Amino acid sequence: HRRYDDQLKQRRQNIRDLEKLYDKTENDIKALQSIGQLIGEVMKELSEEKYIVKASSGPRYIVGVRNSVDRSKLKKGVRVTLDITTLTIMRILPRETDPLVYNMTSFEQ
Amino acid sequence: MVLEATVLVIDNSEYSRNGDFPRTRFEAQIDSVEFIFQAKRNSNPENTVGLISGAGANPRVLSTFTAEFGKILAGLHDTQIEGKLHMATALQIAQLTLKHRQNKVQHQRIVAFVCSPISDSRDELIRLAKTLKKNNVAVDIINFGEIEQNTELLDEFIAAVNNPQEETSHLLTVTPGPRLLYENIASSPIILEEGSS
Amino acid sequence: TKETVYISSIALLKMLKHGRAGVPMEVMGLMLGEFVDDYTVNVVDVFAMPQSGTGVSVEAVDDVFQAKMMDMLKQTGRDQMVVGWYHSHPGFGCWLSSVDVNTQKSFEQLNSRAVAVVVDPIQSVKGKVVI
Amino acid sequence: IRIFRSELQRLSHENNVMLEKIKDNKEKIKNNR
Amino acid sequence: HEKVTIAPLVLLSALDHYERTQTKENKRCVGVILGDANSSTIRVTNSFALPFEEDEKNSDVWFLDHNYIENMNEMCKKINAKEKLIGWYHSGPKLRASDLKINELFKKYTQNNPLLLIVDVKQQGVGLPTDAYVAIEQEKTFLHLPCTIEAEEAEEI
Amino acid sequence: MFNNHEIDTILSTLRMEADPSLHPLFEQFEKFYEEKLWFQLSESLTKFFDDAKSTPLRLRLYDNFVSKFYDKINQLSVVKYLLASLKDSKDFDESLKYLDDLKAQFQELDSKKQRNNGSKDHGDGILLIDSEIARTYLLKNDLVKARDLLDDLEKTLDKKDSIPLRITNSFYSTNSQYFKFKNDFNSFYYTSLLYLSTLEPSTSITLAERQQLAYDLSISALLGDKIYNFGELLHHPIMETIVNDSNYDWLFQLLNALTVGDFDKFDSLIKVQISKIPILAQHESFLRQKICLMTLIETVFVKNIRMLSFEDISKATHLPKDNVEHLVMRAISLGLLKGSIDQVNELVTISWVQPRIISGDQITKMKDRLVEWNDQVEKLGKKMEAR
C-alpha cells in the first residue's frame, strides 16, 4: 500500500523535471538553423524602392526593400539590416558603431 | 505459437455513462489492452497490435500497428465517455486498417467489445460479415450489454460469417462483478489457444 | 542517343526550396522515376536529406533515415527507382563542390547511368535558369 | 491498493515514452555542432 | 483579417499525387500543408500527401495514419524550421459529409485555427482552382479567406 | 411510473460491490410522494425524461451524495440536472444560504481530479461556479453592485472557450433582468436575440417556459428600433407554440400596424401599462417609415432611382410635413440610418444601413442588370473580339 505510494510520487517528479529539459533542447535546435543577415549604413537616397548604401562587410551595393518595410524612417547614415541573398533592407536598427555599453560606461539610476 | 496482427476496438455509447458494473466500467477495457499485448508481442516477435475507436467523438484510428503500447495508451486518453454509437463504422475502418499494413501475409484478427445491443441495420451487417469471410478475418466479439443479450444484430452477424470456428469468429460472454476478466479470456479462443495461422 | 534530363514542374521548385537555408551551406537529395535510354528521361519525385557535419561526402547520406523514409514511398504511390542523387552547392569555377569527390564514383557502381544535379546560381539567379 | 499500483505502472512506461523523443533529439544537436 | 498565401510549389505538388496514384472520382487525395499561421499572412511553403482511403458507402469511415503525420513533420524540420502544422489539404471538387468528420483530427496537435484547402484538378469555371477555408465553431462555421499566390525571387522567375 | 421508485433502488441494492453505503432514511421517505410523479430532482436517468417545478424536500440529503455520484454515472449529471435545476424552486428565502453549499462542493471537485489534463472526461466544473454567482447578487444589493461582479464573468466568456453554450446563456440570463428593470431595451433586444439561434439537442423546455420566454422576447421589440421587428420572433417556432390571445397577439397586430399605420387597433386591445409611456408610440413611427425607406434604392421600385419628396412620405407615414422632417432626423440620430435632407428641392437622401430579411422582389430587378449588360456582349463585346 504505502510502498507503491512513495514510488508513485518519485516517478511523477522525475517526469516533470526532465520534461522542462527536453523541451528546451527541442526549442534551441530550431533556432540554430536560422539564416543570418548583413549590416550596412545608408549613404544617399537614390529612389523609393532603390537605395544607395555602404555595407560594413564589404563594398557598396544597391539595395531595396522586400515586404512590410517602413521607408519613412530610412534616412542618410541610418544603420540598416541588409539581406544576404536578395540584398534588400529587412529590419530597422539604430545608429551605432562601437559598443556604448562596454567601451563607454553605462549605468542606470 | 501466436503470430498475427490484431486490431483492438474501444467504443462508447449511451450505455457508456455507466461504471457501476463491478464498481466501475471503462477501467476493464484499459486493463484488457495490457493483457492482450503481453500475450502476443512477448510470445513471438513481429507481433504488432493496433487500436481504433469507432465511437465517442469521431470514428478515427487511435494507434496503428507498432511495437510499443505507449502510443496505444495515449489513444485511450482524452476520449469522451458519452458519445455517438456506430459499430458498423469501426468494422469498415478495421478492414481498411488491415488492408494497408506493414509486414503483409499474416493472420488478420479483430477484437471488439460490446457496449450496447448495436441496433443499426440488418442487411448492411450481412454483407459486412460475408466480406470479412473471403479475406479470412478473425472477428473476436465479447458480449457484455445488460445481463444477457440474444436474438439481435450481433447474433445475426456471427451466423452469417462463421461456419469454421478458429478461422473466422468466436463468442464469449463476461459477467460483471467479482470475476476475472483476463483469466476467462485466456482460456477462451480469443487470445492464445488456437486460431493463429 | 544520350539521356536528356526532362525537369518536371515540381522537380525545379523543390531544388530551390531544399537549398533555401544559407548561401554557403549545402544539402542533397534523391532523384526518382524510371526511364529508358534513347529518349525517355524523367524525374517523378524529389526529396531532401538532413545536413550533417561532414558536408557532402560518402558518409553524408544516412541509410537509416533513407530506409525509414523509403517505406513511406510505397503507400503514397511515391515509390520509384532511384535514378541519381541531386545536391546543392555554392559553386566554383571548376569542381563546384570541393568536398564532393568520392560520392559519384561510389554511385556509378550501382548504376552507371545515374547522374547528379546541383543548382548553380544560389543568389546568382538570372532567369535563363542555368543549372 | 489497486490505484497506487495501476498509476505507478502507467507513469513508469510514459516516462520512457518521453525518453523516446530525446533519442532522436540527441542526433539533431550532434549534427549541428 | 487573415489571408491565405499558396506558393506555386504547393499547388503543383498536390496535382502530382493525383496522377501518380491513379486516383479516380471515387477517391480524394488528402495532404498536409506546412507554414506559419501565427501572423495575419498565412504562407504554405511545403506540402505532402498521406495514405488516405475514402469510402462512399459510409462517410464516417476514413483511413488515416497518425504515425506518418508526426514522423514526416519531424523529419522535414531539418530543411526549414519555419514549417509547422497549420492545417491540411484534400482533393475533390466538392465537400462531402466525410470532410466534416475529419476536421477534428489535426486540431489536437494544432495550436491556432487550422486551415483547410480544396485542390481541384479539373478547375471547372471561373478562377481559383484551390479554395481555402477556416474551421471554427461557436456548429461548424466556415469562412473563405482571400486566396493569393506569392513566391520567392527564384521561384517566380 | 415506478422507474425512479424501483430501478433507482434496485441499482443501489445490487451493483457497486455490496451497497454504496445506503442510509436508512433513503427508502423510508421515498414512498411519501406515492405515484404523484414528483421525484424532487429525479436524479439523472429518470430525471432526463421527467422534470417538474416541485420544490425538493430532500435538499438536506442528496446534497451529500455528490461523492456517490462520481462512481455512479458521471459528474456531468450535476450541471445537467439536480443542483443546476434548483432554479425552478422559486424559493427566495434560501437566498445567501445556498452560496456556501453550491460553491465549496465545486471547489473540492476542482482541487481533487481536474488540474490541467485531468482524468476520465473533460470540460466539467467550469460554468458550475459562474452560474450561481450572478443569480445571487442580482437580489439584495442594487443592480449597480451586481454589475461589478459581471465584469469577471464577461471576461471569462471572451477568454475561455468550451463546447457547452451554457456559459453564454447563464451570463445573459442574469443580464436580461438587468436591462429589463431599466430603460434602453435596444441592448436588451440584442441580448434577447442571442438566446435562440439553433439548438436542437439542448435547452429542454416545455410549453410553460416558452410563454415566459416569449414575454421577454416580445417586450424587447416594443421599444427596440434595431434589427428588423417582431416578425423575427415569428420566423422562429415561437408564435406557433404559444397562445394567440391574452396579450400574446401583439406580434400579429403590430405587424400590419407598421404598414396601414393605424394606432387605434393596438391601443384598444392593450392595457394602460404600456400606453402611459409616450415613447412606445414614438418608436412605432420609425419602423413604419423604415419599410418604405429601404425601397429607395433597390427592393421593389423598378427604375431603381432614389428620390423622396415631402408629399410622398407624408401620405405613407400618415404624418404631416412638419412631423415627418423631425421623424427622419431622430431616426438617423439613433444610428439606424444615414444621409442628408434637402428642404429646398424637397429631396430626401438616406444611406442604406438597416438590412431586411424579405426577398423575392429582387430577382426581377437583378435581371435588369443581366439583360442590359448582355446586350453589350453581343454588340460591344463582339465588336472588339471580331476586330
CSV table of N, CA and C in Angstrom, one decimal, chain A residues 2-109:
chain,number,residue,atom,x,y,z
A,2,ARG,N,1.6,1.5,1.1
A,2,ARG,CA,2.4,2.6,1.2
A,2,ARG,C,3.7,2.5,0.4
A,3,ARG,N,4.1,1.3,0.0
A,3,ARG,CA,5.3,1.1,-0.8
A,3,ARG,C,5.2,1.6,-2.2
A,4,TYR,N,4.0,1.4,-2.8
A,4,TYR,CA,3.8,1.9,-4.1
A,4,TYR,C,3.4,3.4,-4.1
A,5,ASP,N,3.1,4.0,-3.0
A,5,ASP,CA,2.7,5.4,-2.9
A,5,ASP,C,4.0,6.3,-3.0
A,6,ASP,N,5.1,5.8,-2.3
A,6,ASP,CA,6.3,6.6,-2.4
A,6,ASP,C,6.9,6.6,-3.8
A,7,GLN,N,6.9,5.4,-4.5
A,7,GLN,CA,7.4,5.3,-5.8
A,7,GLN,C,6.5,6.0,-6.8
A,8,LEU,N,5.2,6.3,-6.5
A,8,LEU,CA,4.4,7.0,-7.4
A,8,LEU,C,4.7,8.4,-7.5
A,9,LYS,N,5.0,9.0,-6.4
A,9,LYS,CA,5.4,10.5,-6.3
A,9,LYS,C,6.8,10.7,-6.9
A,10,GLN,N,7.7,9.7,-6.7
A,10,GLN,CA,9.1,9.9,-7.2
A,10,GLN,C,9.1,9.7,-8.7
A,11,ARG,N,8.2,8.9,-9.3
A,11,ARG,CA,8.1,8.7,-10.7
A,11,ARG,C,7.5,9.9,-11.4
A,12,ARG,N,6.6,10.6,-10.8
A,12,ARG,CA,6.0,11.7,-11.4
A,12,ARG,C,6.9,12.9,-11.4
A,13,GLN,N,7.7,13.1,-10.3
A,13,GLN,CA,8.6,14.2,-10.2
A,13,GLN,C,9.7,14.1,-11.2
A,14,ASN,N,10.2,12.8,-11.5
A,14,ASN,CA,11.3,12.7,-12.5
A,14,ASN,C,10.8,13.0,-13.9
A,15,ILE,N,9.5,12.8,-14.2
A,15,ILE,CA,9.0,13.1,-15.5
A,15,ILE,C,8.9,14.6,-15.7
A,16,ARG,N,8.4,15.4,-14.7
A,16,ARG,CA,8.2,16.8,-14.9
A,16,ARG,C,9.5,17.5,-14.9
A,17,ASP,N,10.5,17.0,-14.1
A,17,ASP,CA,11.8,17.7,-14.1
A,17,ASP,C,12.6,17.5,-15.4
A,18,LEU,N,12.5,16.3,-16.0
A,18,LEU,CA,13.1,16.1,-17.3
A,18,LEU,C,12.3,16.6,-18.5
A,19,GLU,N,11.0,16.9,-18.3
A,19,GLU,CA,10.2,17.4,-19.4
A,19,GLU,C,10.6,18.8,-19.7
A,20,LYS,N,10.9,19.6,-18.7
A,20,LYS,CA,11.4,21.0,-19.0
A,20,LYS,C,12.7,21.0,-19.7
A,21,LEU,N,13.6,20.0,-19.4
A,21,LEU,CA,14.9,20.0,-20.0
A,21,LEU,C,14.8,19.5,-21.5
A,22,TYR,N,14.0,18.6,-21.8
A,22,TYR,CA,13.8,18.1,-23.2
A,22,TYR,C,13.1,19.1,-24.1
A,23,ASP,N,12.2,19.9,-23.5
A,23,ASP,CA,11.5,21.0,-24.2
A,23,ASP,C,12.5,22.1,-24.6
A,24,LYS,N,13.5,22.4,-23.8
A,24,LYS,CA,14.4,23.5,-24.2
A,24,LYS,C,15.3,23.0,-25.3
A,25,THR,N,15.7,21.7,-25.3
A,25,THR,CA,16.6,21.2,-26.3
A,25,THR,C,15.9,21.2,-27.7
A,26,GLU,N,14.6,20.9,-27.7
A,26,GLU,CA,13.9,20.9,-29.0
A,26,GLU,C,13.7,22.3,-29.5
A,27,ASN,N,13.5,23.3,-28.5
A,27,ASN,CA,13.3,24.7,-28.9
A,27,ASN,C,14.6,25.4,-29.4
A,28,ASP,N,15.7,24.9,-28.8
A,28,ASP,CA,17.0,25.5,-29.1
A,28,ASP,C,17.5,25.1,-30.5
A,29,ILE,N,17.3,23.8,-30.9
A,29,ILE,CA,17.8,23.4,-32.2
A,29,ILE,C,17.0,24.0,-33.3
A,30,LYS,N,15.8,24.5,-33.1
A,30,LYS,CA,15.0,25.1,-34.1
A,30,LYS,C,15.6,26.5,-34.5
A,31,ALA,N,16.2,27.1,-33.5
A,31,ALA,CA,16.8,28.5,-33.8
A,31,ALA,C,18.2,28.4,-34.3
A,32,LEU,N,18.8,27.2,-34.4
A,32,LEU,CA,20.2,27.1,-34.8
A,32,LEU,C,20.3,27.0,-36.3
A,33,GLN,N,19.2,26.8,-37.0
A,33,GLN,CA,19.1,26.7,-38.5
A,33,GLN,C,18.8,28.1,-39.1
A,34,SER,N,18.5,29.1,-38.4
A,34,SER,CA,18.1,30.4,-38.9
A,34,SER,C,19.3,31.0,-39.7
A,35,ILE,N,18.9,31.8,-40.7
A,35,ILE,CA,19.9,32.5,-41.6
A,35,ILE,C,20.2,33.8,-41.1
A,36,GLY,N,21.5,34.1,-41.1
A,36,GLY,CA,22.0,35.4,-40.6
A,36,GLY,C,21.6,36.5,-41.6
A,37,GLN,N,22.0,37.8,-41.2
A,37,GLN,CA,21.8,38.9,-42.1
A,37,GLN,C,23.0,39.8,-42.1
A,38,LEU,N,23.1,40.7,-43.1
A,38,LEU,CA,24.2,41.6,-43.2
A,38,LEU,C,23.8,43.0,-42.5
A,39,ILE,N,24.7,43.9,-42.5
A,39,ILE,CA,24.5,45.2,-41.8
A,39,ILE,C,25.2,46.2,-42.7
A,40,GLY,N,24.5,47.4,-43.0
A,40,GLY,CA,25.1,48.4,-43.7
A,40,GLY,C,24.5,49.8,-43.3
A,41,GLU,N,25.1,50.8,-43.7
A,41,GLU,CA,24.7,52.2,-43.4
A,41,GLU,C,24.3,52.9,-44.7
A,42,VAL,N,23.3,53.7,-44.6
A,42,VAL,CA,22.8,54.4,-45.8
A,42,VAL,C,23.7,55.6,-46.1
A,43,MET,N,24.0,55.8,-47.3
A,43,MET,CA,24.9,56.9,-47.8
A,43,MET,C,24.0,58.0,-48.3
A,44,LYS,N,23.3,57.8,-49.4
A,44,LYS,CA,22.4,58.8,-50.1
A,44,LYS,C,21.2,58.0,-50.6
A,45,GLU,N,20.1,58.7,-50.6
A,45,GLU,CA,18.9,58.1,-51.1
A,45,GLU,C,18.8,58.2,-52.6
A,46,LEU,N,18.7,57.1,-53.3
A,46,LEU,CA,18.6,57.0,-54.8
A,46,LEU,C,17.2,57.2,-55.2
A,47,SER,N,16.3,56.3,-54.9
A,47,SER,CA,14.9,56.3,-55.3
A,47,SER,C,14.1,55.7,-54.2
A,48,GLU,N,12.8,55.4,-54.5
A,48,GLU,CA,11.9,54.9,-53.4
A,48,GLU,C,12.3,53.5,-53.1
A,49,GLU,N,12.1,52.6,-54.0
A,49,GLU,CA,12.4,51.2,-53.8
A,49,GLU,C,13.9,50.8,-54.1
A,50,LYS,N,14.7,51.8,-54.4
A,50,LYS,CA,16.1,51.6,-54.6
A,50,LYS,C,16.9,52.6,-53.8
A,51,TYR,N,17.9,52.1,-53.1
A,51,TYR,CA,18.7,52.9,-52.2
A,51,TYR,C,20.2,52.7,-52.5
A,52,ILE,N,21.0,53.6,-52.1
A,52,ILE,CA,22.5,53.5,-52.2
A,52,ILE,C,23.0,53.5,-50.8
A,53,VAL,N,23.6,52.4,-50.3
A,53,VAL,CA,24.1,52.3,-49.0
A,53,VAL,C,25.6,51.8,-49.1
A,54,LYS,N,26.2,51.7,-47.9
A,54,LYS,CA,27.6,51.2,-47.8
A,54,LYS,C,27.6,50.1,-46.8
A,55,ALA,N,27.9,48.8,-47.2
A,55,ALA,CA,27.9,47.7,-46.3
A,55,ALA,C,29.1,47.7,-45.4
A,56,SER,N,29.0,47.2,-44.2
A,56,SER,CA,30.2,47.0,-43.3
A,56,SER,C,30.9,45.7,-43.6
A,57,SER,N,30.4,44.8,-44.3
A,57,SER,CA,31.0,43.5,-44.7
A,57,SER,C,31.8,43.6,-46.0
A,58,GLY,N,31.8,44.7,-46.7
A,58,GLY,CA,32.4,44.9,-48.0
A,58,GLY,C,32.1,46.2,-48.7
A,59,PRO,N,32.2,46.2,-50.0
A,59,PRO,CA,32.0,47.5,-50.7
A,59,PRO,C,30.5,47.8,-50.8
A,60,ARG,N,30.2,48.9,-51.5
A,60,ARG,CA,28.8,49.4,-51.6
A,60,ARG,C,28.0,48.5,-52.6
A,61,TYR,N,26.7,48.4,-52.3
A,61,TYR,CA,25.8,47.6,-53.2
A,61,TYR,C,24.4,48.3,-53.2
A,62,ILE,N,23.8,48.3,-54.4
A,62,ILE,CA,22.4,48.9,-54.5
A,62,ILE,C,21.5,47.9,-53.8
A,63,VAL,N,20.6,48.5,-52.9
A,63,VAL,CA,19.7,47.7,-52.1
A,63,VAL,C,18.3,48.2,-52.3
A,64,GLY,N,17.4,47.6,-51.5
A,64,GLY,CA,16.0,47.9,-51.6
A,64,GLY,C,15.2,47.4,-50.4
A,65,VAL,N,13.9,47.3,-50.6
A,65,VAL,CA,13.0,46.8,-49.5
A,65,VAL,C,12.4,45.4,-50.0
A,66,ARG,N,11.7,44.8,-49.2
A,66,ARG,CA,11.1,43.5,-49.5
A,66,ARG,C,9.6,43.5,-49.3
A,67,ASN,N,9.1,43.4,-48.0
A,67,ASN,CA,7.7,43.5,-47.7
A,67,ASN,C,7.6,44.1,-46.3
A,68,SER,N,6.5,44.9,-46.1
A,68,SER,CA,6.2,45.5,-44.8
A,68,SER,C,7.4,46.2,-44.2
A,69,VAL,N,8.2,46.9,-45.1
A,69,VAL,CA,9.4,47.6,-44.6
A,69,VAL,C,9.0,49.1,-44.7
A,70,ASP,N,9.3,49.8,-43.6
A,70,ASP,CA,8.9,51.2,-43.5
A,70,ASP,C,10.1,52.0,-44.1
A,71,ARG,N,9.7,52.8,-45.2
A,71,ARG,CA,10.7,53.6,-45.9
A,71,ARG,C,10.7,55.0,-45.4
A,72,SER,N,9.8,55.4,-44.5
A,72,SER,CA,9.8,56.8,-43.9
A,72,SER,C,10.9,57.0,-42.9
A,73,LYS,N,11.3,56.0,-42.2
A,73,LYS,CA,12.3,56.1,-41.1
A,73,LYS,C,13.7,55.8,-41.6
A,74,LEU,N,13.9,55.6,-42.9
A,74,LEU,CA,15.2,55.3,-43.5
A,74,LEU,C,15.8,56.6,-44.0
A,75,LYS,N,16.8,57.1,-43.4
A,75,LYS,CA,17.5,58.3,-43.8
A,75,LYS,C,19.0,58.1,-44.0
A,76,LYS,N,19.7,59.1,-44.3
A,76,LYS,CA,21.1,59.0,-44.6
A,76,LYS,C,21.9,58.7,-43.2
A,77,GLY,N,22.8,57.8,-43.3
A,77,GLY,CA,23.6,57.4,-42.1
A,77,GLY,C,22.9,56.4,-41.2
A,78,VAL,N,21.6,56.0,-41.5
A,78,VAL,CA,20.9,55.1,-40.7
A,78,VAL,C,21.4,53.7,-40.9
A,79,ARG,N,21.8,53.0,-39.9
A,79,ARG,CA,22.2,51.6,-40.0
A,79,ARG,C,21.0,50.7,-40.3
A,80,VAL,N,21.1,49.9,-41.4
A,80,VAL,CA,20.0,49.1,-41.9
A,80,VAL,C,20.5,47.6,-41.9
A,81,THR,N,19.5,46.7,-41.8
A,81,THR,CA,19.8,45.3,-41.9
A,81,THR,C,19.7,44.9,-43.4
A,82,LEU,N,20.8,44.5,-43.9
A,82,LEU,CA,20.8,44.1,-45.4
A,82,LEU,C,20.6,42.6,-45.5
A,83,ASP,N,19.9,42.2,-46.6
A,83,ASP,CA,19.6,40.8,-46.9
A,83,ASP,C,20.9,40.3,-47.6
A,84,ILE,N,21.2,39.0,-47.3
A,84,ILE,CA,22.3,38.3,-47.9
A,84,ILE,C,22.0,38.0,-49.3
A,85,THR,N,20.9,37.4,-49.6
A,85,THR,CA,20.5,36.9,-50.9
A,85,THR,C,20.0,38.0,-51.8
A,86,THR,N,18.8,38.5,-51.5
A,86,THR,CA,18.2,39.5,-52.4
A,86,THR,C,18.9,40.9,-52.3
A,87,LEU,N,19.6,41.1,-51.2
A,87,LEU,CA,20.3,42.4,-51.0
A,87,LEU,C,19.3,43.5,-50.8
A,88,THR,N,18.5,43.4,-49.8
A,88,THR,CA,17.4,44.4,-49.5
A,88,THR,C,17.5,44.7,-48.0
A,89,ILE,N,16.8,45.8,-47.6
A,89,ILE,CA,16.7,46.2,-46.2
A,89,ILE,C,15.5,45.4,-45.6
A,90,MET,N,15.7,44.7,-44.5
A,90,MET,CA,14.7,43.9,-43.9
A,90,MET,C,14.3,44.6,-42.5
A,91,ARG,N,15.2,44.5,-41.5
A,91,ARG,CA,14.9,45.0,-40.2
A,91,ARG,C,15.3,46.5,-40.1
A,92,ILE,N,15.1,47.1,-39.0
A,92,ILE,CA,15.5,48.5,-38.7
A,92,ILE,C,16.3,48.5,-37.4
A,93,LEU,N,17.5,49.1,-37.5
A,93,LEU,CA,18.4,49.1,-36.4
A,93,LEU,C,18.8,50.6,-36.1
A,94,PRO,N,19.1,51.0,-34.9
A,94,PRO,CA,19.6,52.3,-34.6
A,94,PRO,C,21.0,52.5,-35.2
A,95,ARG,N,21.5,53.7,-35.0
A,95,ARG,CA,22.9,54.1,-35.5
A,95,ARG,C,23.9,53.9,-34.4
A,96,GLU,N,24.7,52.9,-34.5
A,96,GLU,CA,25.8,52.6,-33.6
A,96,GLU,C,26.9,51.9,-34.3
A,97,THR,N,28.2,52.2,-33.8
A,97,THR,CA,29.4,51.5,-34.4
A,97,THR,C,30.1,50.8,-33.3
A,98,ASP,N,30.8,51.5,-32.4
A,98,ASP,CA,31.4,50.8,-31.2
A,98,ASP,C,30.4,50.7,-30.1
A,99,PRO,N,30.5,49.6,-29.3
A,99,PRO,CA,29.5,49.4,-28.2
A,99,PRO,C,29.6,50.5,-27.2
A,100,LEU,N,28.4,51.1,-26.9
A,100,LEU,CA,28.4,52.2,-25.9
A,100,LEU,C,28.1,51.7,-24.5
A,101,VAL,N,27.7,50.4,-24.3
A,101,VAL,CA,27.5,49.8,-23.0
A,101,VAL,C,28.8,49.0,-22.5
A,102,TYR,N,29.8,48.9,-23.4
A,102,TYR,CA,31.1,48.3,-23.0
A,102,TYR,C,32.2,49.2,-23.0
A,103,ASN,N,32.6,49.8,-24.1
A,103,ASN,CA,33.7,50.7,-24.2
A,103,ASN,C,33.4,52.0,-23.4
A,104,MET,N,32.1,52.4,-23.5
A,104,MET,CA,31.6,53.5,-22.7
A,104,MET,C,30.8,53.0,-21.5
A,105,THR,N,31.1,53.6,-20.3
A,105,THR,CA,30.4,53.2,-19.1
A,105,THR,C,29.0,53.6,-19.1
A,106,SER,N,28.1,52.6,-18.9
A,106,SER,CA,26.6,52.8,-18.9
A,106,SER,C,26.1,52.3,-17.6
A,107,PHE,N,25.3,53.1,-16.9
A,107,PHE,CA,24.7,52.8,-15.6
A,107,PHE,C,23.3,53.4,-15.5
A,108,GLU,N,22.5,52.7,-14.7
A,108,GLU,CA,21.1,53.1,-14.6
A,108,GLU,C,20.8,53.5,-13.1
A,109,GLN,N,20.0,54.6,-13.0
A,109,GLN,CA,19.7,55.2,-11.7
A,109,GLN,C,21.0,55.6,-11.0
